[PDB]
Design an enzyme around this catalytic site. Structure first.
Site, PDB file in Angstrom:
ATOM      1  N   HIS A   1       0.792  -1.230   0.000  1.00  0.00           N
ATOM      2  CA  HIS A   1       0.000   0.000   0.000  1.00  0.00           C
ATOM      3  C   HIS A   1       0.810   1.259   0.000  1.00  0.00           C
ATOM      4  O   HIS A   1       1.896   1.320   0.577  1.00  0.00           O
ATOM      5  CB  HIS A   1      -0.943   0.086   1.206  1.00  0.00           C
ATOM      6  CG  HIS A   1      -1.423  -1.244   1.728  1.00  0.00           C
ATOM      7  ND1 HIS A   1      -1.107  -1.686   2.959  1.00  0.00           N
ATOM      8  CD2 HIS A   1      -2.237  -2.219   1.155  1.00  0.00           C
ATOM      9  CE1 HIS A   1      -1.682  -2.892   3.162  1.00  0.00           C
ATOM     10  NE2 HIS A   1      -2.368  -3.216   2.056  1.00  0.00           N
TER      11      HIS A   1
ATOM     12  N   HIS B   1       0.842   4.423   1.818  1.00  0.00           N
ATOM     13  CA  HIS B   1       0.382   5.090   3.028  1.00  0.00           C
ATOM     14  C   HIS B   1       0.437   6.577   2.839  1.00  0.00           C
ATOM     15  O   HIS B   1       1.021   7.062   1.858  1.00  0.00           O
ATOM     16  CB  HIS B   1       1.200   4.639   4.229  1.00  0.00           C
ATOM     17  CG  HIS B   1       0.751   3.319   4.801  1.00  0.00           C
ATOM     18  ND1 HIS B   1       0.170   3.217   6.007  1.00  0.00           N
ATOM     19  CD2 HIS B   1       0.792   2.026   4.273  1.00  0.00           C
ATOM     20  CE1 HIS B   1      -0.126   1.927   6.255  1.00  0.00           C
ATOM     21  NE2 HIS B   1       0.251   1.200   5.195  1.00  0.00           N
TER      22      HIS B   1
ATOM     23  N   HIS C   1      -3.456   4.250   5.219  1.00  0.00           N
ATOM     24  CA  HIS C   1      -3.469   4.219   3.751  1.00  0.00           C
ATOM     25  C   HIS C   1      -3.934   5.518   3.160  1.00  0.00           C
ATOM     26  O   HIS C   1      -4.964   6.051   3.575  1.00  0.00           O
ATOM     27  CB  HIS C   1      -4.395   3.109   3.256  1.00  0.00           C
ATOM     28  CG  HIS C   1      -4.054   1.734   3.779  1.00  0.00           C
ATOM     29  ND1 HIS C   1      -4.389   0.613   3.116  1.00  0.00           N
ATOM     30  CD2 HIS C   1      -3.402   1.322   4.939  1.00  0.00           C
ATOM     31  CE1 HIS C   1      -3.969  -0.460   3.811  1.00  0.00           C
ATOM     32  NE2 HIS C   1      -3.373  -0.027   4.926  1.00  0.00           N
TER      33      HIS C   1
ATOM     34  N   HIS D   1     -11.338   0.448   2.864  1.00  0.00           N
ATOM     35  CA  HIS D   1     -10.261  -0.339   2.265  1.00  0.00           C
ATOM     36  C   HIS D   1     -10.773  -1.469   1.412  1.00  0.00           C
ATOM     37  O   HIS D   1     -11.727  -2.163   1.781  1.00  0.00           O
ATOM     38  CB  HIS D   1      -9.321  -0.861   3.347  1.00  0.00           C
ATOM     39  CG  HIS D   1      -8.268  -1.806   2.833  1.00  0.00           C
ATOM     40  ND1 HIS D   1      -7.064  -1.386   2.412  1.00  0.00           N
ATOM     41  CD2 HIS D   1      -8.285  -3.189   2.671  1.00  0.00           C
ATOM     42  CE1 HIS D   1      -6.340  -2.445   2.007  1.00  0.00           C
ATOM     43  NE2 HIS D   1      -7.093  -3.547   2.159  1.00  0.00           N
TER      44      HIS D   1
ATOM     45  N   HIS E   1      -9.279   2.529  -1.092  1.00  0.00           N
ATOM     46  CA  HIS E   1      -8.463   3.730  -0.886  1.00  0.00           C
ATOM     47  C   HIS E   1      -7.637   3.905  -2.118  1.00  0.00           C
ATOM     48  O   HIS E   1      -7.241   2.918  -2.736  1.00  0.00           O
ATOM     49  CB  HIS E   1      -7.517   3.577   0.294  1.00  0.00           C
ATOM     50  CG  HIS E   1      -8.195   3.294   1.606  1.00  0.00           C
ATOM     51  ND1 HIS E   1      -7.705   2.409   2.485  1.00  0.00           N
ATOM     52  CD2 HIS E   1      -9.347   3.816   2.178  1.00  0.00           C
ATOM     53  CE1 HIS E   1      -8.499   2.368   3.571  1.00  0.00           C
ATOM     54  NE2 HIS E   1      -9.500   3.233   3.381  1.00  0.00           N
TER      55      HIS E   1
ATOM     56  N   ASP F   1      -4.616   1.610  -2.151  1.00  0.00           N
ATOM     57  CA  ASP F   1      -4.763   0.162  -1.972  1.00  0.00           C
ATOM     58  C   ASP F   1      -4.247  -0.561  -3.224  1.00  0.00           C
ATOM     59  O   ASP F   1      -5.023  -0.826  -4.144  1.00  0.00           O
ATOM     60  CB  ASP F   1      -6.236  -0.237  -1.773  1.00  0.00           C
ATOM     61  CG  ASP F   1      -6.835   0.195  -0.429  1.00  0.00           C
ATOM     62  OD1 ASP F   1      -6.128   0.417   0.597  1.00  0.00           O
ATOM     63  OD2 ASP F   1      -8.081   0.270  -0.398  1.00  0.00           O
TER      64      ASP F   1
ATOM     65  N   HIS G   1       3.823  -5.241   3.500  1.00  0.00           N
ATOM     66  CA  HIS G   1       3.330  -5.791   4.752  1.00  0.00           C
ATOM     67  C   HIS G   1       3.723  -7.219   4.990  1.00  0.00           C
ATOM     68  O   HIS G   1       4.071  -7.945   4.065  1.00  0.00           O
ATOM     69  CB  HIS G   1       1.830  -5.610   4.850  1.00  0.00           C
ATOM     70  CG  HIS G   1       1.416  -4.207   5.199  1.00  0.00           C
ATOM     71  ND1 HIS G   1       1.483  -3.730   6.449  1.00  0.00           N
ATOM     72  CD2 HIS G   1       0.936  -3.174   4.410  1.00  0.00           C
ATOM     73  CE1 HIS G   1       1.059  -2.457   6.469  1.00  0.00           C
ATOM     74  NE2 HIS G   1       0.711  -2.119   5.225  1.00  0.00           N
TER      75      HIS G   1
ATOM     76  N   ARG H   1       4.426  -3.535   9.367  1.00  0.00           N
ATOM     77  CA  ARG H   1       5.075  -2.974   8.193  1.00  0.00           C
ATOM     78  C   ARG H   1       6.516  -3.454   8.123  1.00  0.00           C
ATOM     79  O   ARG H   1       7.344  -3.096   8.963  1.00  0.00           O
ATOM     80  CB  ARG H   1       4.979  -1.455   8.237  1.00  0.00           C
ATOM     81  CG  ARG H   1       3.550  -1.000   8.467  1.00  0.00           C
ATOM     82  CD  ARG H   1       3.422   0.487   8.708  1.00  0.00           C
ATOM     83  NE  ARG H   1       2.033   0.810   9.011  1.00  0.00           N
ATOM     84  CZ  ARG H   1       1.552   2.035   9.197  1.00  0.00           C
ATOM     85  NH1 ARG H   1       2.345   3.097   9.110  1.00  0.00           N
ATOM     86  NH2 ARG H   1       0.260   2.194   9.469  1.00  0.00           N
TER      87      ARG H   1
HETATM   88 CU    CU Z   1      -0.604  -0.623   4.664  1.00  0.00          CU
HETATM   89 ZN    ZN Z   2      -6.470   0.670   2.574  1.00  0.00          ZN
END
Ligand code: CU
Ligand code: ZN
Ligand code: CU
Ligand code: ZN
Lengths: 153, 153
Positions: B46, B48, B63, B71, B80, B83, B120, B143
């Site tokens: 993602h 962020h 995000h 999400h 998002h 995403d 992730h 993360r």
């Molecule tokens: Cu994330």
């Molecule tokens: Zn998200």
């Protein structure tokens, strides 16, 4: 109103956080925070064109210069946009950076987000060294620490 | 025509180089690169919100979500802007990341320049988890590695 932060790291001792705040779009940018692990004295302080540390600070390219001009001091008429001048480290090697600049921006044509902030080995001579490098990079030398300039909360 | 590059690092073994390219400003973003040190399987991927690694990967925020949505996966109308779904690391622990996204942008309002790309620890369940955490972050967990997204040559 809108903000920016930047973590300077490199290969040796040089590290510190440098924050950016710009209250309106046309107004000045406040640039503050501290850098450590420096030799006492003046140190070149630039925004470089590319936000690329694939190869550390060397990949960060030349001084950000969208107006295609020559290098100078922050107050000089002739300056690249990234020409932020010198910072001064003390006896402990702590440079308490506190800067206001009206030529850099956090939006528009001269936006510095996603570009690289670099702190150099030697003094930026402000284009006054009397050599080819002087009128280009200020002869500040090697790139001791850098970071991509990134949007802050 | 316009370009971005990102370097992921974390507190462990996860590291890689992720490039972004976009032929026109309205068009899709090609997201390619390679991540190593990963466990085999699926991994959350993602953009962020904050290009802030003062506190490592945490200071990146949640995000990137201008449209203030829930999400989901890159296929979902419920997503998002940041995403980008999953990335698949192989038996050797290497993800050969190649993704196309028309939602993210390198210019405009869905701009991801100066924000943080995160890889992730676990699979992103794409909003299909059956929990609160699923529809906010995707249950991807901790993360592993991150970096700011910067404009490249
Ligand atoms: Cu994330
Ligand atoms: Zn998200
Ligand atoms: Cu420089
Ligand atoms: Zn310069």
């Amino acid at each position: 109103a809108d903000k920016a932060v930047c973590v300077l790291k490199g290969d040796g001792p040089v590290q510190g956080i440098i924050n950016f705040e710009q209250k309106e779009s046309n107004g000045p940018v406040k640039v503050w925070g501290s850098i450590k692990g420096l030799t006492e004295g003046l140190h070149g302080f630039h925004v470089h064109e590319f936000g690329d540390n694939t190869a550390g600070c060397t990949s960060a390219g030349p001084h950000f210069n969208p107006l295609s001009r020559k290098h100078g001091g922050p107050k000089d008429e002739e300056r690249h946009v990234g020409d932020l001048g010198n910072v001064t480290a003390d006896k402990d090697g702590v440079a308490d950076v506190s800067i206001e600049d009206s030529v850099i921006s956090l939006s528009g044509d001269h936006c510095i987000i996603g570009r690289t902030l670099v702190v150099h080995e030697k003094a930026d001579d402000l284009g006054k060294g009397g050599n080819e490098e002087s009128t280009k990079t200020g002869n500040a030398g090697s790139r001791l620490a850098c970071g991509v300039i990134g949007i802050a909360q």
